[PDB]
């Protein structure tokens, strides 16, 4: 038994380990209709229940479909990966030319992951330059947890209908701030 | 009150460079400035040390940290130092520092460490930190058992 | 790249990825090659968790 | 190694910076330097000492 | 834009002292920067009075 218009479960962030930590219905944005007639109460109920709908649509539109709310670890595929462009370097010196000049008596002054592209500072005694193209991304994609920008997309407030209706093994235990899903038991020395 | 090192005639800097070839030195950087791999260092004695005064001829000194998070916290560490041999941590002078001799707060040579008992740790009304994983005494980390003790 | 793009621990390297695999493939090779004389190990820290 | 481990341009090995501004108060001697690393030269900050 | 921020509760003088002991041994006196370690004689602390 429940209101068909329940308050959403806001989800909170543990920025450090990068994953969410619980939920608890929003007790901050509630209205106070306890001094309103039967019609204003209905319009308030309607405003409340429009919210719920927006929240469901938002979730469908943005949140990644998961089999488990608040996973303990996110696969590399689902985490936003920063992929910068390849970094080009313009090599200043000529390796052979400065060896030849130095041996002459001239006293100068002033796995395969690379690309020696010739462009055919500079130096007068040789016209040879060389670009160098390097990958600037990580060696391996990062799996870890999710960041701030991605969090506000994945974890929208979740409307909870008929909240605790039988099957204690089916309750959303991710809503508990100190629930360890791996061992599936609330922990804490406290 | 007896002599001083007032004169600092001159100071300088000395930076020694590895005479790396300009092709590799320009490849070392221009690849070391990508945001993927920026160097990161951690302070060795990573700690948030404070100083709680102990009045002369005083029993247990109580401390209390207000409510806060304990995310990555790992362990305590504590000794006692005489106040007469500890600078006030403030910039410039502190005319109430008239001892020059080792400074345990700075040098790292502690000697009063051998005077401690009953370092009891309590969380909020849950007074046992080790708690369930009890020691021989159940409540507090006892140290330096007194004349008693069977 | 700031905490608004990845979590704090995975950004300051307290957990998640050792330095052998979050650096660029070029730099891990460069650091490996010149490890005898121009050491670069002490700069980047890799995490260790219990 | 022979090719790319040491340059041939005439460049110093150990520089020396003289402060560009001093401030000697009664108990403090603030000295300011402009540590300039040039170009295509990498300085390991461990090798600096007043 | 300054890149060094110092807190009032970061005893970096004591931290460096511990680091040297773990890094090496600091039992040999390095005259370069006074690596002589304050160490009492272990016979006047505990007077073994034969």
């Amino acid at each position: 038994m429940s209101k068909e218009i329940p308050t959403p479960y806001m989800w909170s962030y543990q920025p450090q380990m990068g994953l969410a930590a619980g939920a608890s219905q929003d007790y901050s944005t509630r209205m106070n209709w306890l001094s309103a007639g039967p019609s204003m109460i209905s319009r308030v109920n309607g405003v409340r229940s429009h919210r719920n709908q927006i929240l469901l649509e938002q979730a469908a539109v943005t949140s990644t479909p998961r089999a488990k709310l608040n996973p303990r670890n996110w696969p590399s595929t689902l985490v936003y990966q920063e992929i910068p462009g390849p970094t080009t370097v313009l090599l200043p010196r000529d390796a052979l030319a400065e060896v030849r000049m130095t041996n002459s008596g001239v006293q100068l002054a002033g796995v395969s992951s690379s690309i020696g592209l010739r462009p055919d500072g500079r130096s007068s005694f040789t016209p040879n330059q060389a670009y160098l193209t390097l990958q600037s991304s990580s060696s391996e994609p990062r799996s870890g947890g999710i960041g701030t920008l991605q969090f506000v997309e994945e974890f929208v407030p979740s409307v909870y209908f008929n909240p605790f209706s039988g099957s204690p093994g089916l309750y959303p235990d991710e809503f508990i701030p100190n629930f360890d899903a791996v061992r599936e038991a609330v922990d804490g020395y406290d | 009150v007896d002599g001083a090192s007032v004169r600092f005639d001159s100071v300088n800097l000395y930076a020694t460079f590895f005479p790396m070839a300009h092709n590799t030195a320009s490849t070392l950087e221009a690849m070391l400035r990508n945001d993927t791999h920026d160097q990161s260092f951690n302070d060795y004695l990573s700690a948030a040390n404070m100083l709680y005064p102990i009045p002369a001829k005083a029993t247990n000194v109580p401390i209390s940290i207000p409510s806060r998070n304990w995310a990555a916290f790992r362990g305590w560490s504590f000794t006692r130092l005489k106040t007469k041999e500890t600078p006030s941590l403030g910039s410039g002078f502190d005319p109430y520092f008239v001892y020059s001799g080792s400074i345990p707060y700075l040098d790292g040579t502690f000697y009063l460490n051998h005077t401690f008992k009953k370092v009891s740790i309590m969380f909020d009304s849950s007074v046992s930190w080790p708690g369930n994983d009890r020691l021989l005494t159940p409540n507090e980390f006892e140290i330096k058992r007194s004349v008693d003790g069977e | 790249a700031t905490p608004s793009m990845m979590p704090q621990w995975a950004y300051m390297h307290i957990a998640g990825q050792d330095a052998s695999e979050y650096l660029s493939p070029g730099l891990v090779q460069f650091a490996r090659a010149t490890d005898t004389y121009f050491s670069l190990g002490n700069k980047f820290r890799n995490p260790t968790v219990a | 190694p022979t090719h790319d481990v040491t340059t041939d341009r005439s460049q110093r090995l150990t520089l020396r910076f003289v402060p560009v501004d001093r401030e000697a108060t009664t108990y403090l001697y603030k000295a300011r330097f402009t540590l300039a690393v040039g170009d295509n030269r990498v300085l390991d900050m461990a090798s600096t000492y007043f | 834009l300054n890149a060094v921020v110092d807190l009032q509760d970061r005893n970096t003088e004591l931290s460096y002292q511990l680091l040297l002991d773990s890094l090496g041994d600091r039992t040999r006196y390095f005259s370069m920067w006074n690596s002589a370690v304050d160490s009492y004689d272990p016979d006047v602390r505990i007077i073994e009075n034969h």
């Binding site: - | 060795y44 | 330095a19 090659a33 | 481990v5 | -």
Partner: peptide
């Protein structure tokens, strides 16, 4: 040209003697 440049790696014989994975920066007084 698009040749790929590897690293020189002071040689102990024919092998370039690269080295092991020692990019470790953990001190951690603890």
């Amino acid at each position: 040209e698009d040749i790929n440049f590897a690293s020189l790696a002071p040689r102990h014989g024919t092998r370039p003697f690269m080295g092991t994975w020692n990019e470790i920066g953990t001190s951690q007084l603890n």
